[model samples]
Target: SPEFPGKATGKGKPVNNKWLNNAGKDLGSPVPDRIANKLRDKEFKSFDDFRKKFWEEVSKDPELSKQFSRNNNDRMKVGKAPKTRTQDVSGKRTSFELHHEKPISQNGGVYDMDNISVVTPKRHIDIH
Candidate 1:
């Protein structure tokens, strides 16, 4: 699982309202007070807040996502599993599954599309 970024929750420091407030300004060209405040109070106030911001930044910065996209296939090659469908295949075992190219334990973003894969159970296992 991805570790929380801050304090007792993890090693890094937390994103206080200050940073969120600044992010809003940086993202929205001096975003309105209400919106920026909401960003600090509502968006970045919980565990998922960091996750949300992670995606927000990744989406905002193409450079950030490029590396992830480039590594997508390689990560799948390291480990994989089998999967699939059929009315009667005579003991056939198959099904599609999602494989995390950059394993979540390694700080992979769960919502990162490029960080995962859609493959057979076997392929997924293989990518493990």
Candidate 2:
């Protein structure tokens, strides 16, 4: 709340260490002394706001991501990804891309169906 953390004592006033640290932990400052003003929320304010934003872009929710993870773990040690969908893992695809339940960046299987889900372009776009 200091419009001025200090003014003219050559040593007038100071920034509080805890406020500095917590604010440093939360908001990046164009305002504070360098060592204390570090991080920022670059996007939407809260998680639910981010979730609502994504919901407008995609039909499914985090549950779908969870399902994908669960399916990946369940099938990880067992079977090949089918060329198409099954009742449980089905996506509404007429034509599909082999969507990996775990992602390639995570070292998920590549060129193998075992770790995949059958997804339409829309579903695929929505998934990520």
Which candidate ranks first by lDDT, i.e. highest? 1
The residue-level lDDT of candidate 2 at 34 comes to: 23
| Model 2 stretches astray by more than 4 angstroms | 1-94
For residue 79, model 1's alpha carbon misses the true position, in angstroms, by 25
- What residue runs in model 1 are displaced by over 4 Å at the alpha carbon? 2-93
Per-residue CA lDDT of model 1 for 1-128, tens digit only, reads 43343311211122323322222111111222222222332323333444344334433333323434333323323322111323211244442243445677887644343443344443444344
Q: What's model 1's overall lDDT?
A: 0.33
TM-score of each: 0.30, 0.26
Q: Considering only N, C-alpha and C atoms within 3 Å, which residue pairs clash in candidate 2?
A: 81-113, 81-114
- The TM-score, computed over Cα atoms with residue i paired to residue i, of candidate 2 is 0.26
Q: Least accurate stretch of 10 residues (summed lDDT) in model 1?
A: 23-32
